[PDB]
Design a protein around this ligand. Sequence first.
Ligand code: A1AWA
Ligand code: A1AWA
Lengths: 297, 305
Amino acid sequence: SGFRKMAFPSGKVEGCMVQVTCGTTTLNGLWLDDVVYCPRHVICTMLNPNYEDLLIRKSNHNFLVQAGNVQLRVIGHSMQNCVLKLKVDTANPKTPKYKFVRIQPGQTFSVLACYNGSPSGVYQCAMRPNFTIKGSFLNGSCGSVGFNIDYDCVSFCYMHHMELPTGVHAGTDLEGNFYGPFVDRQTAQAAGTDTTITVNVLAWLYAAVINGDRWFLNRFTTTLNDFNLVAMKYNYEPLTQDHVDILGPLSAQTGIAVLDMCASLKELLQNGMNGRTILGSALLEDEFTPFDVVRQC
Amino acid sequence: SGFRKMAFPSGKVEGCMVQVTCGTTTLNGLWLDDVVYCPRHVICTSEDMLNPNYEDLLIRKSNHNFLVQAGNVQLRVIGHSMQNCVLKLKVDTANPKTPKYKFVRIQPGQTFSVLACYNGSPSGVYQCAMRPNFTIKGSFLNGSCGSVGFNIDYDCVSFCYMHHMELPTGVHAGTDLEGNFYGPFVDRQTAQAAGTDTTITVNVLAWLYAAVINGDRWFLNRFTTTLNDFNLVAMKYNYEPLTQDHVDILGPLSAQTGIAVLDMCASLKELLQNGMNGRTILGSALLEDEFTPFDVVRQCSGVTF
Ligand SMILES: *[C@@H](O)[C@H](Cc1cccnc1)NC(=O)[C@H](CC(C)C)NC(=O)c1cc2c(OC)cccc2[nH]1
Ligand SMILES: *[C@H](O)[C@H](Cc1cccnc1)NC(=O)[C@H](CC(C)C)NC(=O)c1cc2c(OC)cccc2[nH]1
C-alpha cells in the first residue's frame, strides 16, 4: 500500500545521454544507434534566428559530442523541425529498445533532468491541457528527455527546449515537433488557459479509495452531462465516455460506479475539502493517469 | 527554474537488483560484489511469521533452498550468513555491474531515493524522507520487500535503507544494509507501534527558501522571532524543535536569498498559526518537509552524477 508519484527507473535513458557543444553553447543530446538528437538552438548566438541560415554556416567538425569521456566523431548533420540529428561514427552500445511517441495532453511521463550530458535526477510530470509541463529545468537542461517504459521498451515522448516567462516548460517530441504553439525563439509567448485533467483526478480518488481513504465517498450519483456542467464551471476538462471506459477496471476493483465517483468529485469541487486531505494532499491531484494508478495499485 | 521532488538517477542501483527465492517466498535482493543482501524473513513460512526463531530456521536451510535469479541468469549460492535482520547469500560470480558504494546509517529527517522493485525487477523510483519516528511513507506492495534506498555522491552509491515490512497502519519500516532496523521495529507479524511523528522543521524551512528562489514569496513577513519563541509555536504544532545546528545548515540558503533564518522562521510561525488561506507554495496546499537544505542547494545548482 501507499501512494507516491513514481518515475520510471532511469538507467536505460542514462545510457543514451551525451553532451553536445556547438560554438559556445553546450546542452544535452540523446544517443540512439548511430544518431544523436538534440535541440537545434545549440547552433545559436536568439530573438529571431533563421535556423536554416545559421545551420548553413556549421560543418560536422563544428559539433563536439561527448559520451562520458569518449569523444564521438560526427559524420553527418541534418535539421528536422526543432531537433538537430548528428550522425556519428559509432552506434551507442547501450541503445535500449525504443520508440518515438507523441503523447496526448493529460498523459504522464518521467523526465531525466541532465546538465552537460550527465544526470542530476528523475521525476514524473504531465503534459498539461495547454501543452506545457511544470518541471525542474535550469540553464543547460535543454535536451533532457521525457519517457515512458513498457517492460523492455523506452518510448521517448519529450525533449526539453525552453522556459516560458511564466516559469512553465515547453518542448518537442523526438521528431522535433513542439507540443503546443510554441516556437524556439526568445520571445514572450503565451501558454494558453490551463485546465485540470478530470479523468486523472477521478483515477486518484479511485487510488485514495483503494488505500482506505473513503471520507469523500458521498451518497449521491449524477449524470455525465450534469457533472460536465460542473466541470466546465471549475475549469475541469469535459469528461467523455472514452474516459468512463478507461476508468472501468478501477470501477470494478472498488465496486464504485464511475458516475458515483463523479458525484463525489462534484461535491468536492462545490464545497472544497474542508481542511482535510486525500492521500496526503490538500488539493485535487490531476497528474496520475488511470494507467498510473493501476500500475502502482 | 522550477522545483520538483526529484529522485536520484537509478541506473547504478538497477544493475544490482536480483530476485531471491526461498521455499514459496520470493522477494528482492541487492547484489554487490559476490554477496546478495535481502531480508531474512524470506526464509519464513506462513505459520512461522508471528514469532520466527530465525537462527533455528536458518539452520534447517541449505544453499540450494535459496534461488538467486538475475535476469535470465541464475546465480550459484555458495554460503549463507545472517547479519542482524539481513541475509548475506554469497554467490560464485561477482556482480560485473557493481557500482562504487558505501553502506550508511542515515538520521531521521534525511532523504533518500527508493528503487521500488518486484521479482528483482525495477518498477519505479521516488524520493522520500525517514520520518522522525523512523518510518517511511512510501509505495510498497507485496514482493516490494528488499527494495533499497540510497543517495549518490557523484560517483559512489550510499545505500541506507532496505525495505522489510508494512506496519498494520500502512507505513513502512526497514533496516540499514547491516540489517539493523531503523526504529523499534522487529521483523515479526505482530502489531507494533510507530509512535508519534513530528514534522521535520529544518526541511520545511529549506523548502520555503526553495520557494522564494523560485518566485514564490507571498508568505514572507515583516516580523522576526528567536529560536526559543519559535520552538514554542513549533512544539504546539508537532514540529521538531529547531537547533542552532539546523540554523547553521540553512546559512547558505539565507545568504543566497537575503532572508535571515530567524526571519524565515517568523514567516513559518505565522503559517502554522493561520494556514495558507487556500493558497499554494510551490504547488502545494500543505507544508512540505521532505527536502533537506542539501536537497535544495543540490537541485537549485543542478548537481550531476
Ligand atoms: C514485502 O514483500 C511485503 C511487505 C508488505 C507491503 C505492503 C503490505 N504488506 C506487506 N512482504 C512481507 O513479507 C511483510 C513482512 C511482515 C514482517 C510485515 N509481510 C509478510 O511477511 C507476510 C504476511 C503474511 C500473511 O498474513 C499474516 C499470510 C501469508 C503470507 C504472509 N506474508
Ligand atoms: C536551454 O538550456 C534553456 C532551458 C532553460 C533555462 C532555464 C530555465 N529553464 C529552461 N532554453 C533557452 O535558452 C531557449 C533558447 C531558445 C529560444 C532557442 N530560450 C528559452 O528557454 C527562453 C526564452 C525566453 C524568453 O524570451 C527571451 C522569455 C522568458 C523565458 C524564456 N525562455
